[PDB]
Design a protein around this ligand. Sequence first.
Ligand SMILES: *[C@@H]1O[C@H](CO)[C@@H](O)[C@H](O)[C@H]1NC(C)=O
Length: 218
Amino acid sequence: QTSCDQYATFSGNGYIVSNNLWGASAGSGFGCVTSVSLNGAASWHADWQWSGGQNNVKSYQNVQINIPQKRTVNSIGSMPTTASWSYSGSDIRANVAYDLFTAANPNHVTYSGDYELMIWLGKYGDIGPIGSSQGTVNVGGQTWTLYYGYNGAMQVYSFVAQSNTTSYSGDVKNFFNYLRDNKGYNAGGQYVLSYQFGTEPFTGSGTLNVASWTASIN
Ligand SMILES: *[C@@H]1O[C@H](CO)[C@@H](O)[C@H](O)[C@H]1NC(C)=O
């Protein structure tokens, strides 16, 4: 179904589709989400139009999987995911990105953490991640530009693709393993709180169509 309410959600099987217009106050416009099918893989789209607050994210419309029981990164064997998506719109300044929070405390709220991992498959416009570039790295056979910074007490690692990766297959464990083995990330003590995929828009008009999305924690 469709809704434009700030915190609308639609649930089906193991997926939740959310409007999550948390930064609406920073600009003028709207955001709506439509959940098409949530049996097996997820199909949904996000629609929006925003002006003002040039460098402020307006929302993170997204799909995510349910994670009733939190587990440490090292305990998880694989975090496979596939994505098929395309953007349409005008003057788009937005990304297409996975977002995952982890914390040492398994009971931490699931909308923040000690760390945030982002994987940007798409990026339109001049925008960039929080923090500064740590150079390029190879993960799962694809090259990414790695960024690092702080959002309050939360450390944020964002891996950005070198082109718009509209058809993707990977394993998010490869990214956690890179941080564990190269940046001192304590995978043995951090629990995965969320596993989400969506878009952060700044300004413009756009529709993110997600034709297919899957993810799991195994
Ligand atoms: C997405 O495509 C546009 C134009 O082809 C480009 O400006 C932008 O950098 C691309 N994003 C990524 C992640 O490479």
